[PDB]
Write a protein that binds this ligand. Structure first.
Ligand code: HEC
Ligand code: HEC
Ligand SMILES: [Cu+2]
Ligand SMILES: [Cu+2]
Lengths: 162, 281
């Protein structure tokens, strides 16, 4: 499992500056998690004041804010809690409104492509869909079932890789 | 009867059954006049050039001013007995009522018909669901109507819409991306769904008075959507009013149409249409 001692020390070193379970930059978004999960807290928020620290692709780099064991440990510490046909139809019904043509509703320049998503992978997309980023509301539980989330994540991933 | 109406299905609403009564006004108007004009063109096939009136050109008459006045008013009074019945019938349609007795959002997205249920109040005043959450709507920064008993209908599920068969029904007609079309052919009626109907000076909604038959009927899309326009089939079911109360009470706890239609001992998949093999693969 992820080491919660590493998770606490990583929180203190890199996130305590803006987050004491609160948020000093957007007040209401600190203890506010939509469809909160280990996978979503792990995934780098694509929009807002701070971008995900992970280097592109999760490759070793000289400016990473963290390695993978550090990410998992902190995502776990924060998380105390105390078919491509289906994928295409789900995309059209729920996500085409802001992401028609692979673009971004908030910014025309911003896109759902891998260059825009950097070190993207299916798990990172699934997670942001589940609980989602700041721009798009959470989809799990509230709107879409696990098969539908899995299928829409796969469709977005295949469209962006190709 | 059945042959004079050129292939219309028998309407299940009393407003559609008024169309099929007016559609056999093809007899009084079209096939009556369309046999008079055939009865004059095929009458001038007994007027050939035979070898007796060969050196004699005909009477050479060109102007008959009583005839262009009698045979102008007679085509004018037939379209003056129309634009009366086709004003009364469309006034029997386009009709609204502040007790709609079920309200169903249809939300035609790109290619597979996400339905959904809004407020419902029977004439007995017994069911009263009234579910359409505004908190889900505030997650979009719109015109779409979101709710919690929605029928998604993915590419192999072919969405089945369930509505009672003795009550008034309202169809709020929205679309996410493109102008689609909403056509249950048994409702002898069709309205195109638009992206923003209140921004396009549209009417957005229609109502049927009741349904007079039980069973399950096909629904297609008409105005062109794109690639898989032939694959947008939905499929209504007109269940009993007592089986409809047991449909939502199984669905309000949270199941799917493969399970909610099974608890009211009815075939769960669509029985008058089916998913296409050309799209699933
Ligand atoms: C009504 C708004 C809205 C809806 C609906 C929405 N999104 Fe988003 N999405 C955003 C915004 C805004 C961003 C930019 C990231 C941020 O907010 O920081 C975004 C970013 C993303 C990203 C990351 C792109 C990048 O380069 O960082 C993915 C992947 C994504 N969305 C997937 C989806 C999927 C899948 C659906 C539906 C099946 C969806 N979104 C529906 C608003 C939305
Ligand atoms: C160990 C986890 C973690 C650390 C450390 C972290 N963040 Fe975040 N951050 C997230 C997650 C998860 C989101 C997605 C929003 C949510 O949780 O709903 C996010 C979102 C954001 C957003 C909004 C992006 C958007 O589009 O909505 C900003 C801005 C942000 N973070 C800034 C920072 C800054 C600045 C730091 C450090 C100086 C930081 N973060 C450290 C996990 C972290
Ligand atoms: Cu359509
Ligand atoms: Cu269509």
């Amino acid at each position: 499992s992820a080491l919660l001692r590493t998770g606490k020390q990583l929180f203190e070193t890199s996130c305590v500056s803006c987050h004491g379970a609160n948020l000093q930059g957007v007040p209401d978004r600190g203890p506010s998690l939509i469809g909160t999960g280990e996978a979503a807290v792990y995934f780098q928020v694509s929009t807002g004041r701070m971008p995900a620290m992970r280097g592109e692709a999760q490759a070793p780099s000289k400016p990473p804010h963290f390695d993978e064991s550090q990410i998992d440990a902190l995502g776990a510490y924060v998380q105390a809690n105390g078919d491509v046909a289906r994928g295409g139809d789900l995309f059209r019904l729920n996500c085409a409104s802001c992401h028609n043509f692979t673009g971004k509703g908030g910014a025309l320049s911003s896109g759902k492509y891998a260059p825009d998503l950097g070190d993207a992978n299916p798990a990172q997309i699934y997670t942001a869909m589940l609980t989602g980023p700041q721009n798009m509301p959470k989809f799990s539980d509230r709107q879409l079932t696990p098969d539908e989330k899995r299928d829409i994540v796969a469709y977005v991933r295949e469209s962006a890789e190709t | 009867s059945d042959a004079l109406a050129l292939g219309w299905p028998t309407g299940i609403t009393p407003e559609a059954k008024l169309n099929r009564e007016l559609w056999i006004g093809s007899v009084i108007a079209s096939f009556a006049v369309g046999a008079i004009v055939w009865g004059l063109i095929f009458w001038t096939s007994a007027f050939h050039r035979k070898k007796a009136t060969d050196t004699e050109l005909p009477r050479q008459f060109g102007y008959n001013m009583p005839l262009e006045l009698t045979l102008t008013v007679i085509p004018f009074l037939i379209i003056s007995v129309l634009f009366y019945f086709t004003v009364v019938v469309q006034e029997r349609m386009m009709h609204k009522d502040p007790n709609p007795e079920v309200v169903i959002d249809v939300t035609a997205f790109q290619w597979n018909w996400k339905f959904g249920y809004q407020k419902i109040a029977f004439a007995d005043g017994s069911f009263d669901y009234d579910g359409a959450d505004p908190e889900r709507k505030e997650a979009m920064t719109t015109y779409l109507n979101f709710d919690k008993i929605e029928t998604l209908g993915t590419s192999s599920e072919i969405p089945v819409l369930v509505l009672p068969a003795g009550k008034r029904i309202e169809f709020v007609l929205n679309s996410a991306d493109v102008i689609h079309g909403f056509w249950v052919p048994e409702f002898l009626f069709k309205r195109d769904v638009l992206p923003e109907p209140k921004a396009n000076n549209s009417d957005n909604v229609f109502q049927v008075s009741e349904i007079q038959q039980t069973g399950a009927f096909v629904g297609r899309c008409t105005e062109m959507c794109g690639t898989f326009h032939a694959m947008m089939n939905f499929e209504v079911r007109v269940v009993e009013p007592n089986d409809f109360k047991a449909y939502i009470d199984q669905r309000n706890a949270g199941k799917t149409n493969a399970e909610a239609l099974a608890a009211i001992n009815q075939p769960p998949l669509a029985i008058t249409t089916e998913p296409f093999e050309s799209r699933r693969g």
